[PDB]
Amino acid sequence: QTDDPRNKHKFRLHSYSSPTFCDHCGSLLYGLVHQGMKCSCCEMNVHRRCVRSVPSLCGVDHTERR
Numbered sequence: 199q200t201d202d203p204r205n206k207h208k209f210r211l212h213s214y215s216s217p218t219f220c221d222h223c224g225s226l227l228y229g230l231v232h233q234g235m236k237c238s239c240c241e242m243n244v245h246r247r248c249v250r251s252v253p254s255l256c257g258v259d260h261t262e263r264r
């Protein structure tokens with residue numbers, strides 16, 4: 199409850215109203231997730247079974263020159 203580890207994206211199913219499209223398959227998030235699993239670290243919407251297919255590449259930010 200103090201050390202911050204690092205694993206795959208922190209996908210988290212949110213709730214807006216309609217399901218968003220998937221970024222791994224490009225298919226609406228229907229019959230797969232209540233709404234959509236948005237990564238609470240880099241902002242990445244995916245399905246509930248497409249995460250096991252993602253190579254886990256979280257930590258993609260901008261302004262990395264310095």
Ligand SMILES: [Zn+2]
Nearest residue numbers: 207237240256
């Ligand atoms: Zn991410």
Ligand SMILES: [Zn+2]
Nearest residue numbers: 220223245248
């Ligand atoms: Zn998907």
